[PDB]
Structure 1
Amino acid sequence: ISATMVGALLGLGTQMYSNALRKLPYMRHPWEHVVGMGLGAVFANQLVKWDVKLKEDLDVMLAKARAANERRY
């Protein structure tokens, strides 16, 4: 589990999911399977980075809101 094996596995899985959902054999086009693996890995890594950034820029804003509330007295 390194945010990339899960991404690659999920991309390959959704590639076979799309391929077999049209009633086709699962491994029709291997090239789109490998590009799906790549896209899944990239999207998973970027999702992890975006989550970290979202938390980082949410804490610094929640602190500002709490400080603004604390100046009531």
Structure 2
Amino acid sequence: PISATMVGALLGLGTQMYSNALRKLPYMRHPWEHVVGMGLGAVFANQLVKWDVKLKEDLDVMLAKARAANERRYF
């Protein structure tokens, strides 16, 4: 369906064409750069999803510690 790799590749393609358009160049001015941008976008999206998972995992442990400290007050 809709995966991180696909969204990232599409966003990398969009960035290169957006960058070409901001410079008033043709959309496909340097197409190898479009290939590079798709690759980079896919890499970045997969890494971002993995990083989000790791961050949630770490936040769970830290909230566990916070709740333990707060529950210490009622002893």
Normalising by structure 2, we get a TM-score of 0.95
Q: How many equivalent pairs are there?
A: 73
1:9-65 CA deviation, whole Å, 9 max, x = no partner? 000001100011100000000111000000000000000000000000000100110
1:13 corresponding residue in structure 2: 14
Higher helix share: 2
CA RMSD of aligned residues (A): 0.5
Q: Kindly state the Cα deviation for residue 69 of structure 1 after the two structures are TM-superposed.
A: 0.5
1: CA distance between counterparts of 2:62 and 2:31? 46
Map 1:55-66 to 2 at 5 A: 55-66=56-67
Point out where structure 2 has 5 or more consecutive residues left out of the alignment: none
Specify the SS of the correspondent of 2:4: coil
Q: Provide structure 1 residue ranges, at least 5 long, that are not aligned to the other structure.
A: none
Return the alpha-carbon distance in structure 1 between the equivalents of residues 36 and 25 of structure 2: 19
> Aligned equivalents of 2:33 and 2:42: distance in 1?
14
Give me the whole-angstrom Cα distance separating, in 2, the residues matched to 1:15 and 1:44.
16
- Percent same amino acid at aligned positions? 100
TM score, norm. by length of structure 1: 0.97
Structure 2 match to 1:44: 45
